[PDB]
Paper text:
[name] is a phospholipase anchored to membranes via two palmitoylated cysteines located in a hydrophobic membrane-interacting region (MIR). Tecovirimat is an inhibitor of mature virus wrapping widely used to treat mpox patients infected with clade IIb strains. Tecovirimat binding to [name] blocks viral wrapping, but the structural mechanism is poorly understood. We showed that [name] forms a homodimer on membranes, and tecovirimat inserts into a cavity formed between the two protomers.
We also assayed one escape mutant ([name]) identified in vitro but never reported in mpox patients. The mutations identified in the clinical MPXV strains were located at the homodimerization interface and were expected to have an impact on tecovirimat-induced dimer formation, whereas [name] was located further away. Consistently, the mass photometry assay showed that sF13A295E, sF134MUT and sF13ΔN267 did not form homodimers in the presence of tecovirimat at the range of concentrations tested, whereas sF13G277C did as the wild-type protein. As controls, we generated three additional viruses bearing substitutions in [name] known to confer tecovirimat resistance: rVACVG277C, rVACV4MUT and rVACVA295E. As expected, all the control viruses could be rescued and grew to high titres.
Residue numbers in the entry:
A (entry chain A), B (entry chain A): 6 to 372
Write the structure that this text describes.
Amino acid sequence: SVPAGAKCRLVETLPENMDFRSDHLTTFECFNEIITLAKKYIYIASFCCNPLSTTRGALIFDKLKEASEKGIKIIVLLDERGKRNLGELQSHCPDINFITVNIDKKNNVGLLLGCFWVSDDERCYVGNASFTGGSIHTIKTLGVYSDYPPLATDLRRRFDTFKAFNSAKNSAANLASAAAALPVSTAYHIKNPIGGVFFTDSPEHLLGYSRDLDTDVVIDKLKSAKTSIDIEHLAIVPTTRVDGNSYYWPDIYNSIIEAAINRGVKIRLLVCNWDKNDVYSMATARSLDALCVQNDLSVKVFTIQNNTKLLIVDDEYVHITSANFDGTHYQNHGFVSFNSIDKQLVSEAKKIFERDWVSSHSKSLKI
Amino acid sequence: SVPAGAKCRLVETLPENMDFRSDHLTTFECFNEIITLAKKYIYIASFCCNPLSTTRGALIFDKLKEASEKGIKIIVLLDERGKRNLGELQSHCPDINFITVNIDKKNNVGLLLGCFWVSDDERCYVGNASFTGGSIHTIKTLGVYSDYPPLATDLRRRFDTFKAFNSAKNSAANLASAAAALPVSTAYHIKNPIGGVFFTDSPEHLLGYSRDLDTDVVIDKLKSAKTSIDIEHLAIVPTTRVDGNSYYWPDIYNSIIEAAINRGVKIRLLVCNWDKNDVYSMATARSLDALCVQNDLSVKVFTIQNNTKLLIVDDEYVHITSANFDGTHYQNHGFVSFNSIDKQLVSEAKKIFERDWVSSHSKSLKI
């Protein structure tokens, strides 16, 4: 028999300067358990790699340094734009195999946002706590830990698809034939969960034929919302700025409004504050301001460093990821998202959203 | 051989209290020519029927009264919500067959917005000048007249589909079997124009299998815009209010923004002013205000009574109709739209839009 929830428990970073308190596992405690119980390998992936920026991040980097010196195969994947610290990371850990990743060499837009750990095909972490000292110590994060082998092995297959994109000779990033010979395998998806948990992937040109697009799954869960929509992300502005040109993409921005106006869904949004010089964020904020007074919608903002990417629908489906709901992320960026329908696991996630909604850092939307 | 433009020339209403001037045919001159040259029948359709509200409208109603007394079969289609004047219209013209129409008895939402004339299968008018004294004399309108038999006959087939929906015993409005036996025929569409002119229809449950949806054709022409988008409609607010509940529909609202931001299309919009008490119109206006300063977009408003529904794309495609770009109209309301790609006919339409854009009634968008 398979366990309910796939042995998943919540993991988050709650800095001391913030009022967030919980009994769940912490991100610092989570990374120590993965390195301690490691016997075969430790595979880590994130956008930027910089553990030495805080105290707790350096201790995790020392435990990973000691693990690499005992025979554990350590491979760290980072986007080629976090290449500044590469000379610093290799100088402190010569046994750790640092690999730069460029998943999109056709247009140089897709970034490696896969934020997850995996070890021995048994234990794994996934969330938005990137391999940075801030995301371990000073930046609020939110993730999930599970010691279930079948769930960690399916996340390891996500690592194999991302590892092939290396800026070194002929590979999945340089050849079109070596990239088509990639086994893009997934053991579980929205049509076959494991313990009520499944992974959604991104972008579309890296799904193959079996994996499900995270864009289609999130939109379907938002269009199928009946009672409540709770989102804690960076921003839900439908317009992003790639290079020096603005990009418009309101797919997520419309499926949420379709729930509040047409279906009367009680929606609560918790995004960051916005630049007053950004006309796309001011117009988006004033558009949401007229909806809170006309429908059952509520918006609060915060100014702290928080990478939390949370989505809860009808207290029945939860969605934790590292990418933000926008056009640039769900069209080009590569990442893996956590999807679960376990009522007990969603209830603990609803407990976290209610904590952050009434927190002192969450001031009401004022324009 | 077939003539270019299908013998089409512009027709509009330019009241004396307004500064609009042109050498084209007027709506009052257009209705006199149709009644004078009538030999077989005159079929008229609009939402509300009230010709006696102005001077020119009463003269058209007298010419139509004299035509009905000579043997011309006069059938007037009006929506069952314009039934107030029905006792007045029949009292002045007993020989004219007035018919109330309810195209949607399933939900009582679809309204008869078909605004067109047709006579002898030879001459026909189509636009937004409804059968009202205002739309002939005091309300600015815009339409097209053509004495081409094949184009008028295809518009008569639109009248046959609308006439079947009568609130009288068993018919297309009462029976589901008598409504399926309806010949829903079109001779020309977007895949087969006549002289560069074709009709698009609405709603979707009245198209059959041959007619093209006006919603799909307009969105495709907006998504295929390369240089310019010129629209003169009532309003492009993505939210409408059906009954006492708001309805959200941004399909047209998004395809236009996709052109200005992603494709850099120079777009000029001329809509009416909005109620300051309407939060959906204020948020929509402030959203457009931040786009005019960030992209090549310009918006002007007017307060006069104007039913003009115009759409020009890249000076190559023109779209004149009676319904407004919104959710309630293109989802439920029944109407026929004028579509033409004739360069000479679009050039005359571009001449009209430039006149209304710099007119004194078109004040710049101020918030």
